[PDB]
Amino acid sequence: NHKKWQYNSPLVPRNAELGDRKGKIHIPFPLANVTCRVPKARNPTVTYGKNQVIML
Amino acid sequence: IEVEGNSQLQISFSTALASAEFRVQVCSTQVHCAAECHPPKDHIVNYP
Numbered sequence: 001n002h003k004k005w006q007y008n009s010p011l012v013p014r015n016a017e018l019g020d021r022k023g024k025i026h027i028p029f030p031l032a033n034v035t036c037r038v039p040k041a042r043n044p045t046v047t048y049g050k051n052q053v054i055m056l
Numbered sequence: 057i058e059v060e061g062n063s064q065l066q067i068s069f070s071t072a073l074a075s076a077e078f079r080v081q082v083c084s085t086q087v088h089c090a091a092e093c094h095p096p097k098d099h100i101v102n103y104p
Contacts, residue, residue: 046097047098048097049099049100050099051100052100053100
């Protein structure tokens, strides 16, 4: 059926007659940088000494 | 600070000394201040 294009699949053999003949097509859903909404955190206490800090 | 005549001024000071004896120069005149300073939470300090 020499009347069609197919993805260059490694699971399908190459056409024996034609050489390294190939085309290219744009694809949907490209990877893009966006924003993800999520959450945060907290803290603690503190005692002192000569040139020394102690945290629990 | 703005001066008027026979009045008084209020200032804020920082020290690490428990017994702080210091001189304050307002314009060209010096005044001695005697201060008994109490602990806040222990040695080490959180400001430069």
